[model samples]
Target: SAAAVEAQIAALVAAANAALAADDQAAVRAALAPLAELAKEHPELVAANPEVQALLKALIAKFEEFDLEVQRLVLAVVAELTKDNPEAVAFLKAAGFWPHLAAALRHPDLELVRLALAILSSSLAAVEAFVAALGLEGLEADLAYLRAAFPDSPAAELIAKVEALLAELRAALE
Candidate 1:
């Protein structure tokens, strides 16, 4: 039975990759149910199985890796987890998902930051006012989301960026 479930997960991953290759975004969305179930049932898989979490982390690894193909799978998984499962979102948040996302923004990988930005755009809807206060353009928005998501991360440069964006937004709105 374990082997059967693993095989099913493997098949789901394959379907995700194929959906990505075809640019079939709907298929990607459809594929996430199984993965989300897996994530829900086996949150331990991430810590125990080295490759379990890598599928989602790939979106924040590098430019080449952050392409639309990768996003199809990554975004779908995120949406599934965050939208229907508050516990999943809480687990992700408590386990330093926001910090990891902030770290992604500080790195040289622009795509990583952009993906974080996208996640922030969605996450902020349920987060603090500081998140809603973000600018809608440029890296400023990205910075604002970083600060709101990870208030005390070690990303000094990103913190400064967010502060500057806030100041500018305040001045402009006032």
Candidate 2:
């Protein structure tokens, strides 16, 4: 059963690679869209499939090429995969998505940061890893731009969502 699912995932990944190489958003979306639901429903298969992992790595490497909406879509996929799934967490740990999420917090686009924070908030392990890798000073620097920009930027609602996430993670680190 797992092998069967992996084959399906491989097919999607193959389509995704072609779409990505062609820089075709609609085709990429078509290929990537189903993977998210599959990741949500079949975390075990996604975690175990090497070919699927390769495609995920490819997406992370080309994250900036994606529109924020697509970025959020992938982030949600990661969020689902990491939730209650240690295998996926360790794989993503090896794949280096946390560092990218940490970096996204400081991205000038609030939407990107929003995408990242949802993942970070949904996955406590991801939050822990990010703070662990970034360290206290590193987190301060990461927070600097957010602190300055979020206040007057008319996303206090977003700030609301982000603040409790940090505070809880801050308390967890303590």
Candidate 3:
């Protein structure tokens, strides 16, 4: 049974790699979508599987390899995988996901910013580290920009939550 499971995961990763090699975004999404569902439904298995871990790490590192749709899909997948999983969160932090995500806050795409914020929110333990990396002034500037850029949008609510989180981070540092 374990061997069968491993074979399934290997096949998925191979398909994903092949799609990426072929520069086929649709195929990439098709390959990764099931993995995301697997992560959400059986997080333990996804967490324990080294192959899945490696696939996630590679996706994180080479996110730009895909189109924006695929980028968002993979990011949402990461959030799902790491949610309530301290070990997975630690892996994301150790791999320097925070700064990259924070930079994503500056992206022009509101949905991308939303997804990035969601992923960053999953790392509660790394809040202090993120604040240290981005600095209070940087976060404050980002908030101002978001407030101005996304006025009267649902992103406003997320921006408020992010602001509150940043406040907590600042209070923790002080």
Candidate 4:
């Protein structure tokens, strides 16, 4: 059963990649929908099983090789899964995905950084919904990380934005 599940995941990824390479939106959505379904139906699976977490990581990595459209599709699915899934979000956070994802804010490719932001930004609501979610206290970590990841570059804007968001968030809650 595990093998079958893995195979299905692989096939969906393959089809999504193919659709993206060919610039086929309909095909890409068709391919990605099933993965999203699996994530939604078994959100705990992501947090419960190392195998599933690995699968998600592998999928994210595999998406990195795809073109922009496919990257968007991949991000959309991740957001859908983690947006309302506390277990999935906790799993990702505990597995050190937050730092890895934060680093992505400094990706040389603006599109990649933007997509990563979209993915992370979407999860903010779910993170807030999570029982132990804390407000902006460690928020500077992301700015520091971005500054380090990008060094001297346009990502400074991103760092500044993070700062601004933290400031506003803090002010709002206080």
- Cα RMSD (angstroms) for every candidate in the order listed: 11.5, 3.8, 2.7, 8.8
lDDT of each: 0.49, 0.71, 0.73, 0.55
| Candidate 4 lDDT score relative to the true structure | 0.55
Q: Per-residue lDDT tens digits of candidate 4, residues 1-174?
A: 656665556676677667657767678768876767765565444334444456456545555455565555556556566654545666565544565455455556665565455445444433342213333544466557656766566556645644654555566667
Any runs in candidate 1 off by more than 4 Å, and if so which? 46-51, 61-100, 103-174
What's the C-alpha lDDT at position 56 in model 1? Answer: 52
The alpha-carbon lDDT assigned to residue 147 of candidate 2 equals 68
Clashing pairs in 1: none
Q: How far out, in Å, is residue 89 in model 1? A: 14
What is residue 8's positional error in candidate 2, in angstroms? 2.0
Candidate 3: regions farther than 4 A off? 1-8
**In lDDT terms, how accurate is model 1?**
0.49
Using TM-score as the yardstick, the better of models 1 and 3 is: 3
Model 4 CA lDDT for position 36: 71
Residues 84-112 of candidate 2: C-alpha lDDT, one tens digit per residue: 65456566677777777786777777766
* Candidate 1 local lDDT, 114-160, one digit each (tens): 44444444333323332332223434655655566554444444356
Top candidate (TM-score)? 3
User: Which pairs clash in model 3?
Assistant: none
Q: How many residue pairs clash in each candidate?
A: 0, 0, 0, 0
Instruction: State the lDDT at 72 in candidate 2.
Output: 66
